[PDB]
């Protein structure tokens, strides 16, 4: 929802 | 056998291409490069530049000078307009699909048909006016005040792009012959018979390519997907082209121009 | 292939109240969903990662458009969502939205439709949709692209394997990508406007920005 | 309407 997406892709 | 008549309609519309639009890629790029005996075309960089070279150049000219290179951009379209119509009329079939449709596809396709054959007079640094004669750099033409400093730099970013496949003339007439015969511009009345029709241009556009430019694995996909930029930059330019309405004056809007606009979304 | 219209079935076969608000909805439940299909799609969870953000905010919703209007390939006049639901075109033309609703029926679904699409080449064309170099910024440029340039390969190549008596199906799938564009545009074009203005059931992830 | 493309079309 705000960044987030590193995660969201690099578990 | 099929692939003789495929380079048939190939040379066919290459032959109508080269009849029809007096400034080609191969003239072109001889300017750009100066591999050519004319002098070279006269440079405009700035305004002082703008006015030395505006004489010897391609009606109401007592207009400012964003206003006086808009409407030297949309004569030249109008030209244009006609060029390509006169080209459209030489693929074969596309003269006996229905008049209304006829119409629609130009009145959709032109604009795909004026920037990406454009390209082939531009260099990243400028566009080639004038047939030739003049070379207007593309930071004069961002300096240019809002809106009109926005027209042309879309261009030029598309075609860096797309000259980076590195087509020829004899490539571009296929290509652009594919672009006309599009079965999804809408309020098409028959649809199948212009896919017939762009189906044969796809298949020779495919022989085209690969003939042409066996080292340049996907040249036709790569190509087929700049379809979908230029089904942008068309976009963004129409918008644009609002905005000088809603934005700017009485300025005469050629009616060749109005009709192709006329409730063109 | 060296990349494979199978490794790509898998994404696929894998990642499987008022009309005005139902449908964002949908698609918020939907960008979850297209976190986790670009996930297996050879060679690409190599180099960077922003980057293969940049990209999934690039078309988010045209990978997304296809999604639903494939799906509605067995509906008439209407979609099926992501939860169920139907938006029939009658709720969507009085819902305001109808037109941009009728492009998505008769061009893409119908398209779809008549040519009989499967569901290989919507991951195909999705993953060059998504390979999309024409995103700002990336330590190679070549990268979204010499790799989208094998999706045109074997896509290539399982369109004459599977459909020997097409030959000009390879181009009618990348020729279908197009009015995608287009519709991608103005379905953003409408997002914005039922958006920072008020009044719409926005959700927290379609809100990640626009 | 968009009778100046007709003429050009239809021109020979
Ligand atoms: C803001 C919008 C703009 C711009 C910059 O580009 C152009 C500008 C003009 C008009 O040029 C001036 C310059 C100075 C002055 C003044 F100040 F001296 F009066 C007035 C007008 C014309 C054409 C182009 S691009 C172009 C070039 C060649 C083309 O065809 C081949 C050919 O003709 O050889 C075509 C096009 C465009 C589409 C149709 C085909
Ligand atoms: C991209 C959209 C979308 C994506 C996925 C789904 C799905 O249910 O799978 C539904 C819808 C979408 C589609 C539409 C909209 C807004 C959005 C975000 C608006 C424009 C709001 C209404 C019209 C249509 C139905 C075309």
């Not at chain 2, 750009?32 to 009606?59: A, R, W």
């Not at chain 2, 020779?204 to 379809?227: G, T, W």
């Not at chain 3, 197009?178 to 008020?198: D, N, Q, V, Y």
Request: proline share 4%.
């Amino acid at each position: 929802t705000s960044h987030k997406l590193v995660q969201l892709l690099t578990t | 056998p099929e692939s003789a008549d495929l380079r048939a309609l190939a040379k066919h519309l290459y032959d109508s291409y080269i009849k029809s639009f007096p400034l080609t890629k191969a003239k072109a790029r001889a300017i750009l490069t100066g591999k050519t005996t004319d002098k070279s075309p006269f440079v405009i960089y700035d305004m002082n530049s703008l006015m030395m070279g505006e004489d010897k150049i391609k009606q109401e000219q007592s207009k400012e000078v964003a206003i006086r290179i808009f409407q030297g951009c949309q004569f030249r379209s109008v030209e244009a307009v006609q060029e390509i119509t006169e080209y459209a009329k030489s693929i074969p079939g596309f003269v006996n699909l229905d008049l209304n449709d006829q119409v629609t596809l130009l009145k959709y396709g032109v604009h795909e048909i004026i920037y990406t054959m454009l390209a082939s007079l531009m260099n990243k640094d400028g566009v080639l006016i004038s047939e030739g004669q003049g070379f207007m750099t593309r930071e004069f033409l961002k300096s240019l005040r809002k809106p009109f400093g926005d027209f042309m730099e879309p261009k030029f970013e598309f075609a860096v792009k797309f000259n980076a496949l590195e087509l020829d003339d004899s490539d571009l007439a296929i290509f652009i012959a594919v672009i006309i015969l599009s079965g999804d511009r809408p309020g098409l009345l028959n649809v199948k018979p212009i896919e017939d029709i762009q189906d044969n241009l796809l298949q020779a556009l495919e022989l085209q390519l690969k003939l042409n430019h066996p080292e340049s694995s996907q040249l036709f996909a790569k190509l087929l997907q700049k379809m979908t930029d230029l089904r942008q930059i068309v976009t963004e330019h129409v918008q644009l082209l609002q905005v000088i309405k809603k934005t700017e004056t009485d300025m005469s809007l050629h009616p060749l121009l109005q009709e192709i606009y006329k409730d063109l979304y | 292939e060296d990349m494979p219209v199978e490794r790509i079935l898998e994404a696929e076969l894998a990642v499987e109240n008022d009309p005005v608000t139902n449908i964002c909805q949908a698609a918020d439940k939907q960008l979850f969903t297209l976190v986790e299909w670009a996930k297996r799609i050879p060679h690409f969870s190599e180099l960077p990662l922003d980057d293969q953000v940049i990209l999934l905010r690039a078309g988010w919703n045209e990978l997304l458009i296809a999604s639903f209007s494939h799906r509605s390939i067995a509906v008439k006049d209407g979609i099926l969502l992501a939860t169920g639901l139907h938006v029939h075109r009658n709720s969507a033309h009085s819902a305001g939205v109808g037109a941009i609703f009728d492009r998505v029926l008769t061009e893409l679904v119908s398209k779809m439709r008549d040519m009989q699409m499967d569901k290989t080449e919507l991951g195909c064309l999705r993953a060059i949709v998504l390979f999309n170099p024409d995103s700002k910024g990336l330590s190679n440029p070549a990268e979204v692209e010499a790799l989208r340039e094998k999706v045109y390969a074997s896509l290539e190549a399982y369109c004459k394997h599977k459909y020997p008596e097409q030959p000009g199906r390879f181009a009618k799938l990348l020729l279908r990508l197009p009015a995608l564009r287009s519709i991608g545009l103005k379905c953003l074009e409408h997002l914005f406007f039922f958006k920072l203005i008020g009044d719409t059931p926005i959700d927290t992830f379609l809100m990640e920005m626009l």
